[PDB]
């Protein structure tokens, strides 16, 4: 179960700016 | 400096200067 968010699909200045709130 | 941040210590680095603190989720599913 290793997701691939921001590691090879999506993520690029837009959804981050809050990875930890 | 956010560029090609896909694994390889990138998600960590880019995250080592965004939260401004040492402590985040970084946890997979069980």
UniProtKB/Swiss-Prot annotation, chain A:
Disulfides per UniProt: 6-11
Protein name in the entry: Insulin A chain
Organism encoding this protein: Homo sapiens (Human)
Record gene name: INS
Included range, full protein: 90 to 110 of 110
Swiss-Prot record, chain B:
Transmembrane segments: none
The protein's name: Insulin B chain
Organism: Homo sapiens
Gene behind the chain: INS
Residue range from the parent sequence: 25 to 54 of 110
């Amino acid at each position: 179960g290793i997701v691939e968010q921001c590691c090879t699909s999506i993520c690029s200045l837009y959804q981050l700016e809050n990875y930890c709130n | 400096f956010v560029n090609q941040h896909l694994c390889g210590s990138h998600l960590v680095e880019a995250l080592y200067l965004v939260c401004g603190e040492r402590g985040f989720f970084y946890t997979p599913k069980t």
